[PDB]
DNA sequence: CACAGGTCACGAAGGTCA
DNA sequence: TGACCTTCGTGACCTGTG
């Protein structure tokens, strides 16, 4: 029940690995805009709950490494059929709650 | 007894074909929903107790393939007139 | 018993805004 | 950035019928 990236307190699985809230939304930001980070000082930064801000090249890296897919982030494209489909079943659930 | 989907225990058939209960509910809410699904890996997942939930796209496919039958699942008229047939022969007894 | 559907607590996507 | 929130899909378990 800890984050595997930066040890903080994992809220349960999140693009299948036991990530924090953190570095749930960092992945997925990270990812969706194919961000290339490089790291300042060695390439090893032991990522804590506290300084896993400063080391982004690292942090995205000890993500991946602990399992985190990024197929898991929804596709652009997909977010749409939720976003929309949404008032679909709200168009037709309306219409059934009406007859 | 084993479902023929994801390996976990099964309980039987369910739209003819022997499966677990996540899959029973899996296939008929995608098939009534109309759900379309894409695979984001080769499209050929190995689905397993442990990650079906990981690829739909390849789990109901895969449904699919051993045989399970949309057509055994209730449409709503169907749901409908049974819970009038549950409400009949419940004020009725 | 076998098997349709029904229930609802719970997991994990995205969103939001200090 | 990330804490907290909204949503909807999941599946263990249950009811009702044949
Ligand atoms: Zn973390
Ligand atoms: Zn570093
Ligand atoms: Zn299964
Ligand atoms: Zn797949």
């Known amino acids: 029940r800890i984050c595997g990236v930066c040890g903080d307190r994992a809220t349960g699985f999140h693009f299948n690995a036991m990530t924090c809230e953190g570095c749930k939304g960092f992945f997925r930001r990270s990812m969706k805009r194919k961000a290339l980070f490089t790291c300042p000082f060695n390439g090893d930064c032991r990522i804590t709950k506290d300084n896993r801000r400063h080391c982004q090249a690292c942090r995205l890296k000890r993500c991946v490494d602990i399992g985190m897919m990024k197929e ?18 709200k168009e037709e659930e309306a219409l059934k709650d009406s007859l």
Do not use: W
């Open 72 to 89: 898991f982030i929804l596709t652009d494209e997909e977010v749409q059929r939720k976003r929309e489909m949404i008032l679909k079943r």
